Design a protein around this ligand. Structure first.
Ligand SMILES: CON(C)Cc1ccc(O)c2c1C[C@H]1C[C@H]3[C@H](N(C)C)C(O)=C(C(N)=O)C(=O)[C@@]3(O)C(O)=C1C2=O
Ligand SMILES: [Mg+2]
Ligand SMILES: [Mg+2]
Ligand SMILES: [Mg+2]
Ligand SMILES: [Mg+2]
Ligand SMILES: [Mg+2]
Ligand SMILES: [Mg+2]
Ligand SMILES: [Mg+2]
Ligand SMILES: [Mg+2]
Ligand SMILES: [Mg+2]
Ligand SMILES: [Mg+2]
Ligand SMILES: [Mg+2]
Ligand SMILES: [Mg+2]
Ligand SMILES: [Mg+2]
Ligand SMILES: [Mg+2]
Ligand SMILES: [Mg+2]
Ligand SMILES: [Mg+2]
Ligand SMILES: [Mg+2]
Ligand SMILES: [Mg+2]
Ligand SMILES: [Mg+2]
Ligand SMILES: [Mg+2]
Ligand SMILES: [Mg+2]
Ligand SMILES: [Mg+2]
Ligand SMILES: [Mg+2]
Ligand SMILES: [Mg+2]
Ligand SMILES: [Mg+2]
Ligand SMILES: [Mg+2]
Ligand SMILES: [Mg+2]
Ligand SMILES: [Mg+2]
Ligand SMILES: [Mg+2]
Ligand SMILES: [Mg+2]
Ligand SMILES: [Mg+2]
Ligand SMILES: [Mg+2]
Ligand SMILES: [Mg+2]
Ligand SMILES: [Mg+2]
Ligand SMILES: [Mg+2]
Ligand SMILES: [Mg+2]
Ligand SMILES: [Mg+2]
Ligand SMILES: [Mg+2]
Ligand SMILES: [Mg+2]
Ligand SMILES: [Mg+2]
Ligand SMILES: [Mg+2]
Ligand SMILES: [Mg+2]
Ligand SMILES: [Mg+2]
Ligand SMILES: [Mg+2]
Ligand SMILES: [Mg+2]
Ligand SMILES: [Mg+2]
Ligand SMILES: [Mg+2]
Ligand SMILES: [Mg+2]
Ligand SMILES: [Mg+2]
Ligand SMILES: [Mg+2]
Ligand SMILES: [Mg+2]
Ligand SMILES: [Mg+2]
Ligand SMILES: [Mg+2]
Ligand SMILES: [Mg+2]
Ligand SMILES: [Mg+2]
Ligand SMILES: [Mg+2]
Ligand SMILES: [Mg+2]
Ligand SMILES: [Mg+2]
Ligand SMILES: [Mg+2]
Ligand SMILES: [Mg+2]
Ligand SMILES: [Mg+2]
Ligand SMILES: [Mg+2]
Ligand SMILES: [Mg+2]
Ligand SMILES: [Mg+2]
Ligand SMILES: [Mg+2]
Ligand SMILES: [Mg+2]
Ligand SMILES: [Mg+2]
Ligand SMILES: [Mg+2]
Ligand SMILES: [Mg+2]
Ligand SMILES: [Mg+2]
Ligand SMILES: [Mg+2]
Ligand SMILES: [Mg+2]
Ligand SMILES: [Mg+2]
Ligand SMILES: [Mg+2]
Ligand SMILES: [Mg+2]
Ligand SMILES: [Mg+2]
Ligand SMILES: [Mg+2]
Ligand SMILES: [Mg+2]
Ligand SMILES: [Mg+2]
Ligand SMILES: [Mg+2]
Ligand SMILES: [Mg+2]
Ligand SMILES: [Mg+2]
Ligand SMILES: [Mg+2]
Ligand SMILES: [Mg+2]
Ligand SMILES: [Mg+2]
Ligand SMILES: [Mg+2]
Ligand SMILES: [Mg+2]
Ligand SMILES: [Mg+2]
Ligand SMILES: [Mg+2]
Ligand SMILES: [Mg+2]
Ligand SMILES: [Mg+2]
Ligand SMILES: [Mg+2]
Ligand SMILES: [Mg+2]
Ligand SMILES: [Mg+2]
Ligand SMILES: [Mg+2]
Ligand SMILES: [Mg+2]
Ligand SMILES: [Mg+2]
Ligand SMILES: [Mg+2]
Ligand SMILES: [Mg+2]
Ligand SMILES: [Mg+2]
Ligand SMILES: [Mg+2]
Ligand SMILES: [Mg+2]
Ligand SMILES: [Mg+2]
Ligand SMILES: [Mg+2]
Ligand SMILES: [Mg+2]
Ligand SMILES: [Mg+2]
Ligand SMILES: [Mg+2]
Ligand SMILES: [Mg+2]
Ligand SMILES: [Mg+2]
Ligand SMILES: [Mg+2]
Ligand SMILES: [Mg+2]
Ligand SMILES: [Mg+2]
Ligand SMILES: [Mg+2]
Ligand SMILES: [Mg+2]
Ligand SMILES: [Mg+2]
Ligand SMILES: [Mg+2]
Ligand SMILES: [Mg+2]
Ligand SMILES: [Mg+2]
Ligand SMILES: [Mg+2]
Ligand SMILES: [Mg+2]
Ligand SMILES: [Mg+2]
Ligand SMILES: [Mg+2]
Ligand SMILES: [Mg+2]
Ligand SMILES: [Mg+2]
Ligand SMILES: [Mg+2]
Ligand SMILES: [Mg+2]
Ligand SMILES: [Mg+2]
Ligand SMILES: [Mg+2]
Ligand SMILES: [Mg+2]
Ligand SMILES: [Mg+2]
Ligand SMILES: [Mg+2]
Ligand SMILES: [Mg+2]
Ligand SMILES: [Mg+2]
Ligand SMILES: [Mg+2]
Ligand SMILES: [Mg+2]
Ligand SMILES: [Mg+2]
Ligand SMILES: [Mg+2]
Ligand SMILES: [Mg+2]
Ligand SMILES: [Mg+2]
Ligand SMILES: [Mg+2]
Ligand SMILES: [Mg+2]
Ligand SMILES: [Mg+2]
Ligand SMILES: [Mg+2]
Ligand SMILES: [Mg+2]
Ligand SMILES: [Mg+2]
Ligand SMILES: [Mg+2]
Ligand SMILES: [Mg+2]
Ligand SMILES: [Mg+2]
Ligand SMILES: [Mg+2]
Ligand SMILES: [Mg+2]
Ligand SMILES: [Mg+2]
Ligand SMILES: [Mg+2]
Ligand SMILES: [Mg+2]
Ligand SMILES: [Mg+2]
Ligand SMILES: [Mg+2]
Ligand SMILES: [Mg+2]
Ligand SMILES: [Mg+2]
Ligand SMILES: [Mg+2]
Ligand SMILES: [Mg+2]
Ligand SMILES: [Mg+2]
Ligand SMILES: [Mg+2]
Ligand SMILES: [Mg+2]
Ligand SMILES: [Mg+2]
Ligand SMILES: [Mg+2]
Lengths: 67, 96
RNA sequence: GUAGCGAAAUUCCUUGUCGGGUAAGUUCCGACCUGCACGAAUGGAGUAACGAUUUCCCUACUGUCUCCACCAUGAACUCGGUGAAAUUGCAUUACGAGUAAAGAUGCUCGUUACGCGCAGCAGGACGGAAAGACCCCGGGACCUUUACUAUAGUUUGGUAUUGGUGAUUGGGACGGUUUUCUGAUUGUUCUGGUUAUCUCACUGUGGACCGUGAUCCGGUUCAAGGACAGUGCCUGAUGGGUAGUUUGACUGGGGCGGUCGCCUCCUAAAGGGUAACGGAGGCGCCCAAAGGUUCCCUCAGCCUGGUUGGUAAUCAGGUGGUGAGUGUAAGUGCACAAGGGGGCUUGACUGUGAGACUGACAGGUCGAGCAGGGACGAAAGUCGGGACUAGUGAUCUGACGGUGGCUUGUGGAUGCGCC
RNA sequence: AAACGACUGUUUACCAAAAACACAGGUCCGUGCGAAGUCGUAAGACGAUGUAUACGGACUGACUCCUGCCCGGUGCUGGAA
RNA sequence: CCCUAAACCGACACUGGUGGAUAGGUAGAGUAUACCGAGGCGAUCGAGUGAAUCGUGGUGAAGGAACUCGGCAAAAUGCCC
RNA sequence: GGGCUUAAGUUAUCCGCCGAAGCUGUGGCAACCUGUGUGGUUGGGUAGGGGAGCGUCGUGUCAGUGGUGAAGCUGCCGGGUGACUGUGUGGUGGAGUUGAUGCGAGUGAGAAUGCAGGCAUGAGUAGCGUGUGACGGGUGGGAAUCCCGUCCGCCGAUUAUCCAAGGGUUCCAGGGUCAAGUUUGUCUGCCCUGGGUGAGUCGGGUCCUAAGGCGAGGCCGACAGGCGUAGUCGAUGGGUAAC
RNA sequence: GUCCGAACCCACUUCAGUUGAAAAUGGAGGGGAUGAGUUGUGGAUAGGGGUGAAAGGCCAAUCAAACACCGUGAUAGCUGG
RNA sequence: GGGGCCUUGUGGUUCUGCUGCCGCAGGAUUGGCCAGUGAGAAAUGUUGCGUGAAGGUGAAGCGUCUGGGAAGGCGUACCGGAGUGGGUGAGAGUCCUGUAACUGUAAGCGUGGCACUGGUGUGGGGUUGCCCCGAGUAGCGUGGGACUCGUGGAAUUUCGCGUGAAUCUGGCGGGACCACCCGUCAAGCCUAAAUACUCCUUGGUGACCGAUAGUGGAUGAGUACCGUGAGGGAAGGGUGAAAAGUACCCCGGGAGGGGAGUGAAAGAGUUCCUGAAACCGGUCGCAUGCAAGCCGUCAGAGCCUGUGUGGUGAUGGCGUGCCUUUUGAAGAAUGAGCCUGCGAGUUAGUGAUGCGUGGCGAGGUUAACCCGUGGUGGGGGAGUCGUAGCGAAAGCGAGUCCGAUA
RNA sequence: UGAAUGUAUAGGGGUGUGGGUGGUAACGCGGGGAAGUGAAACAUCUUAGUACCCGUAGGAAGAGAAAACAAGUGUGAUUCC
């Protein structure tokens, strides 16, 4: 049978043109008042995963190209 | 992950949405057009770019990375501004 | 906490104390009350009779014993027949003092010992039998309850079954008395609450009759109820009656106690890092100034003089470099002040981030330069909160504001996305 | 002679026969009969071919003398501004 | 045909369990017990041998619970008038 | 440990030797690096990673081979760095199977208190299930254990006799001694063959009902089903004619 | 629901057995033995249920939820191989 | 849309009543386009085909050699629309059974199809004025279920309980809802084929098993046996080509053996092919009764043998099992009495992701299915991956996104 | 024929007209409907509408001739791949 892809991984991770795995930075959904604009700038970007985490995400995606 | 909140839970969900009616433009470049129609392709068409390679039964947008030293009449579905500018500079045209 | 009872089937201390019994009595039985922690239908205190119940004593009686002996028998033992069992890494399987996974037939150093049988005894082979029944850890089961979430049942009201006619009580329709109105209303319709009636709805019932010569059942009828009850659906309450489950870890075993994230110091062995239920403390804030900027100032202590006034309030002179101070722990800092004061302000900005620091990662931290638009300063310039480092919470889901990217035939709407 | 249970009985087949259970007696609560209670989805049935001197539940446990104070908590019963 | 069993229930040709009927004599209250009757059996490995020891019985000087957690077991008592 | 001071004790110092799978010499194997004439470095190893193989079975193809003896089994003589092996040589055996090269695996066992069978160990050991047998004669290949007889002992509210339940041919006669019988056995409740059970009255049915079961219709229940009327069964009882 | 005591029913003590004669018995005593007695035959109650003079006892020789089959090759961060 | 209202049209008529002495309908052998045993508003005899169940025919070899036996060897011929097998005393194309090919089928309830018989039967155009078009239904509320959708922005669909419509200028659907547009006409019914399956029947097949395997079952197998019952549930295959199964004699009561016969073989004698290991013995060689032994190993005398290598081994040195699990085990931690057999990394996906290798290459590749009853081959490009990325997306595009066209 | 009873029905008496009963390996349709398991606990969810169960077929069944899709043209019953 076909292998299903992981739903959370589908919704959370992207794969770039060069095979890099990127996610959205965590920690900016709420409780933003005490955070400086510098902290929000650090948390508003797009993070590139480490090699091990990227391999795990690629295993979780059943060939799904990411969101 | 051993009980630690796993990456696929700690990372925030990329939100957004998908366009239900999004169409994807098969793209051909001026490098490829020049290479596959070197003898000054007079009137290239969707069928001609398909017999070369455009993956037919799709819209056949033409993009403009290249030089296009020849004169060519593209007759395709949509084109980029730089591609159009290069085409009229070389002396060709686009249609549709 | 009464009557009564009490070192008791209850008394920890405890062999309480006294008295009886014995030559000697932690037991006994009668008392004391100092009841750790009696007590009146989970009955209190008694009680003739009863007890293969528990306890103490006397007598009789005895191999229970001093202290065993002897006799006969079924096994044991020899011969003939028949003929298992658990167990089993191995074998030509000593002792001593050692050594080693800390208890050796098997290793070391020594000592002793001819080969093989038979009857015996149980010190060892950590002997055999049962993947310890205690302990802990994982799982399960059943039990309990004011654990959680449900549920049968019981119960509430609505509504359907469900109709007829009334009164007695509230809200309008509605005009046309009042006085559209603070206040009164009536009639003409409409709609709630409450309540009493009526009866080929219904009740599964009391009598009679018939199916039938049947204590079932049904039908007819009478009586009694009666739109109630019953039942369906919806709904609130109740519900260990029942069901599924949860009930953390660390830990010099576990339990109890304590602890769990963040910050500072020491341990920490002069980079960084470094554990213990190691040694000390803090944090879950605060401040519209205690932020920004610009200019100005120097403290604490000590000595002397001085109304109230004293060690110490305010004042003067002298001395005094950090020992004062710092919103808040501690350290590193800060007198060039980052400490004290005045002026003007909102940078406690928007768009950014070269380049680095630090973590397994999520992440945490610093940051030049630039644009916009400001504050302060004559300018140089400084300003993306606070001398620095704690004052915090990923994701999910939902919410508000803005934006308008998307919207399933189109236009809206609605929903979503983005910030 | 003391403790316990009044007694005869009953009980852990296969480690406990007892001071445990039962018991006669006692009290409280429920039940007006299609009873309450119980089995069952229901019809039915037991209760009972019984009718409050009965039936069901609870605790106590022959007999003698007795059974005190507390309704704040919880439960039950009644009441409904 | 077996049938208070070698034939049934116990895996056995198993010192266990299995309902009913008949059931004489003497001693005796007796269907207890002893020895016998009607009738039936000698039991399904034997032969020996004074070992220790274990089981099962027997007797015991003087003492008489000194035993032991405890008079456990045994002994004594026992019937009729 | 023996023993040692007459050091074989301590200490300073000198001269020798012993001593490892270390080093060196010699011979073989292997991995890697290197310019590729040389040479250099390396080769303990659990978990584990990489590489290259042995053996078994099936199978495509080619070459074959086999009663002048395949497979299997079992000796001897050999071979390889290993799993293993000989195209050496016998024995047993009686119908298949070898080499090359591919292909496919139910492809390798010493452990799982593993499963099945066979067989050891304990061991000629414990036991042979309450007891009283003795003798004379007989039978027989064989007799404590079979038959007959005589003594003796045992049971006798049962070790007797007859039923029910249950069993099912064990009953009788004759033949038998592999197995079974806790020994032996000529014997048997065993084996083999044949035979044996006679009812108007006995015990049941043809008669009766109890508890209880089933239950025409029926009532109840989503279905499945529950209950129950009329009935109809059901002895452990009633009724019923022989000694 | 008297007394002593056989049958009968029981199971208090002790010894033996404990690879037993026996997966609970045997020897010696012991309790009840006209009663809430005991026993034969047939029947009824069934597994979250039965029944229980109540021990969580018993329900076909292991019952804090029987047995058989099925879901099923349940699952096991554990032990073994 | 239909009914109605009309302008016409019914198969050529014997020539009946009614509507108007117009027309309508019954009528009757006869055409007849047709249509038929089907779901089709229906269902009743005679004639044309190859066959299934049984059968029939079915080609073509001898001679020598060794052997118990020829299918083997050697020589030499034949058949083949037949060389697929399986038998026969060993390995057969021509010995047997068959096979190829052809043929028969009477019969079937036969069956399928054809003819006939027989049985059954037209519309087109206009027209709104009217009439009809499936009701406790659709909807709505509520409590549940199914839809990717787990109550939600909740369409569509469904059950219980309430409530309850329009009906053509109408109803429903197009994911709340409304409008328009597009589609469609629910609340009546029947419908072959492609699809699923095998207790059975017939034929065939297997890099499937070969008696601990394969069914539990190659045999009295759901049997023996166990359980009250539901239920559980085995083990045991092989003489030889042919019984020619050992006449007769001897020891023995027999059992068993010894002679002899049968047979190629009897050490193939029925417990019978082959006959391994554990295990149990006889014989021979050496060692062993002064010795402390994880049982071996290295050194090594003597003896035996010499089939000149082998067997044995006095005596000396060194030396604490295997596995598991462990910081650490000879361990007095676990498991194993012994041998033989059996017993654990598999398989399936046009799964995911690497690598090796082969093909093709800016292209690669098919899936279902169709053809090949002749297979493993050919077709099939629907799809799918590569061919452009960036963005939540509109979109833009070698750029894009955040941003101010920074 | 017609009860109570008036209509009449229930019922009763004929007649025998037709059908039913039960079995069956898989496949079908309609309905009822687990748990172990997974989620490293667990309750939503999962397992799974699976196991099992009830009713009921046929040689196949079910479905089926648009109150359908589509999205601007169009497709034209259902089933299956
Ligand atoms: C007074 O402390 N002493 C030392 C203990 C002890 C003393 C005398 C005994 O007579 C028994 C015991 C222990 C228990 C253990 C029980 C246990 N069970 C209850 C879970 C168990 O696990 C088994 C078993 N079959 O494994 C049993 O044997 C068991 O039931 C039983 O019977 C026991 C006895 O007999
Ligand atoms: Mg947000
Ligand atoms: Mg902010
Ligand atoms: Mg956590
Ligand atoms: Mg005292
Ligand atoms: Mg005390
Ligand atoms: Mg005293
Ligand atoms: Mg009181
Ligand atoms: Mg009280
Ligand atoms: Mg008390
Ligand atoms: Mg009392
Ligand atoms: Mg008292
Ligand atoms: Mg008393
Ligand atoms: Mg007593
Ligand atoms: Mg005395
Ligand atoms: Mg003896
Ligand atoms: Mg002997
Ligand atoms: Mg030591
Ligand atoms: Mg020692
Ligand atoms: Mg030693
Ligand atoms: Mg040794
Ligand atoms: Mg000995
Ligand atoms: Mg001995
Ligand atoms: Mg010992
Ligand atoms: Mg032990
Ligand atoms: Mg254990
Ligand atoms: Mg246990
Ligand atoms: Mg034990
Ligand atoms: Mg639990
Ligand atoms: Mg249990
Ligand atoms: Mg109600
Ligand atoms: Mg109501
Ligand atoms: Mg009234
Ligand atoms: Mg009335
Ligand atoms: Mg009235
Ligand atoms: Mg409870
Ligand atoms: Mg509970
Ligand atoms: Mg669970
Ligand atoms: Mg835990
Ligand atoms: Mg813990
Ligand atoms: Mg502790
Ligand atoms: Mg440091
Ligand atoms: Mg350091
Ligand atoms: Mg550390
Ligand atoms: Mg300052
Ligand atoms: Mg702020
Ligand atoms: Mg940077
Ligand atoms: Mg920090
Ligand atoms: Mg600026
Ligand atoms: Mg200025
Ligand atoms: Mg500050
Ligand atoms: Mg400041
Ligand atoms: Mg979550
Ligand atoms: Mg659409
Ligand atoms: Mg922003
Ligand atoms: Mg007293
Ligand atoms: Mg006392
Ligand atoms: Mg008593
Ligand atoms: Mg009493
Ligand atoms: Mg008594
Ligand atoms: Mg009893
Ligand atoms: Mg007992
Ligand atoms: Mg009473
Ligand atoms: Mg009632
Ligand atoms: Mg009654
Ligand atoms: Mg009491
Ligand atoms: Mg009060
Ligand atoms: Mg009170
Ligand atoms: Mg109240
Ligand atoms: Mg008898
Ligand atoms: Mg017997
Ligand atoms: Mg028997
Ligand atoms: Mg007399
Ligand atoms: Mg007697
Ligand atoms: Mg006699
Ligand atoms: Mg007799
Ligand atoms: Mg016997
Ligand atoms: Mg002797
Ligand atoms: Mg005596
Ligand atoms: Mg004497
Ligand atoms: Mg004496
Ligand atoms: Mg005397
Ligand atoms: Mg005396
Ligand atoms: Mg004493
Ligand atoms: Mg003493
Ligand atoms: Mg005594
Ligand atoms: Mg006595
Ligand atoms: Mg050396
Ligand atoms: Mg070396
Ligand atoms: Mg060397
Ligand atoms: Mg190596
Ligand atoms: Mg080395
Ligand atoms: Mg390894
Ligand atoms: Mg040959
Ligand atoms: Mg072979
Ligand atoms: Mg090969
Ligand atoms: Mg294998
Ligand atoms: Mg093996
Ligand atoms: Mg075995
Ligand atoms: Mg032996
Ligand atoms: Mg002997
Ligand atoms: Mg022995
Ligand atoms: Mg012996
Ligand atoms: Mg003996
Ligand atoms: Mg005897
Ligand atoms: Mg005898
Ligand atoms: Mg005799
Ligand atoms: Mg006698
Ligand atoms: Mg007598
Ligand atoms: Mg008979
Ligand atoms: Mg016979
Ligand atoms: Mg027999
Ligand atoms: Mg006989
Ligand atoms: Mg014998
Ligand atoms: Mg005989
Ligand atoms: Mg005989
Ligand atoms: Mg009769
Ligand atoms: Mg009856
Ligand atoms: Mg019926
Ligand atoms: Mg009768
Ligand atoms: Mg009868
Ligand atoms: Mg009495
Ligand atoms: Mg009896
Ligand atoms: Mg006892
Ligand atoms: Mg004992
Ligand atoms: Mg008495
Ligand atoms: Mg019964
Ligand atoms: Mg208890
Ligand atoms: Mg039992
Ligand atoms: Mg349970
Ligand atoms: Mg499952
Ligand atoms: Mg498992
Ligand atoms: Mg273990
Ligand atoms: Mg022929
Ligand atoms: Mg030939
Ligand atoms: Mg319609
Ligand atoms: Mg709708
Ligand atoms: Mg709804
Ligand atoms: Mg759903
Ligand atoms: Mg709806
Ligand atoms: Mg729409
Ligand atoms: Mg249909
Ligand atoms: Mg088999
Ligand atoms: Mg074999
Ligand atoms: Mg076999
Ligand atoms: Mg049976
Ligand atoms: Mg031959
Ligand atoms: Mg042979
Ligand atoms: Mg054999
Ligand atoms: Mg053989
Ligand atoms: Mg010697
Ligand atoms: Mg030694
Ligand atoms: Mg350890
Ligand atoms: Mg060991
Ligand atoms: Mg050992
Ligand atoms: Mg262990
Ligand atoms: Mg072992
Ligand atoms: Mg083994
Ligand atoms: Mg395409
Ligand atoms: Mg049928
Ligand atoms: Mg669950
Ligand atoms: Mg779970
Ligand atoms: Mg788990
Ligand atoms: Mg159909
Ligand atoms: Mg059509």
């Amino acid at each position: 049978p076909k292998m299903k892809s992981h739903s959370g991984t589908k919704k959370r991770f992207k794969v770039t043109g060069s095979g890099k795995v990127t996610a959205r930075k965590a920690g900016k959904r709420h409780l933003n008042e005490h955070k400086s604009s510098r902290v929000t700038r650090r948390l508003t970007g797009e993070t590139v995963l480490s090699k091990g985490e990227a391999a795990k995400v690629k295993k979780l995606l059943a060939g799904h190209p990411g969101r | 992950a051993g009980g630690q909140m796993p990456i696929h839970m700690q990372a925030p969900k990329l939100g957004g949405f998908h366009n239900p009616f999004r169409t994807e433009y098969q793209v051909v470049n001026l490098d490829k057009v020049e290479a596959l129609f070197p003898k000054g392709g007079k009137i290239t068409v969707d069928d001609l770019v398909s017999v070369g390679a455009v993956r037919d039964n799709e819209l056949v947008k033409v993009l403009g990375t290249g030089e296009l030293t020849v004169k060519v009449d593209l007759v395709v579905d949509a084109w980029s501004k730089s591609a159009q500018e290069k085409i009229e500079k070389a002396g060709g045209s686009v249609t549709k």
